[PDB]
């Protein structure tokens, strides 16, 4: 409350290391669904039903341009674009499966680095 803080966790080297895992994330061989913007022109039904799209490229320049406040905005905008996978794509496909195994990547790396 006011004049009454929790100890300061250092943030310093939060741009770094979400940088980083989002490297990781853009290297792995099952992120293909994942780099650009799904092409709303092309894919019947996505602009309707995803009201929020995300996606690698996207989260990489909000990255690299402060648009992220906080490494928690950044894990937000990471599980959206697998809530949206998840959301469009069914589990037994192939982009159903590389959506389930990008997260499980992703909230490892996540727990390793930050928790």
Request: charged letters at 35%.
């Amino acid at each position: 409350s006011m004049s009454v803080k929790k100890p300061k966790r250092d943030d310093s080297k939060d741009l770094a290391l979400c940088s980083m895992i989002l490297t990781e994330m853009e290297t792995h061989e099952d992120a293909w669904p994942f780099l650009l913007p799904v092409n709303l022109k092309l894919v019947p039904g996505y602009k309707k039903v995803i009201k929020k799209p995300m996606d690698f490229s996207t989260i990489r320049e909000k990255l690299s341009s402060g648009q992220y406040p906080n490494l928690e905005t950044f894990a937000l905008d990471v599980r959206l674009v697998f809530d949206n996978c998840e959301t469009f794509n069914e589990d037994d496909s192939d982009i159903g499966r590389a959506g389930h195994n990008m997260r499980k990547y992703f909230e490892k790396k996540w727990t390793d680095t930050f928790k």
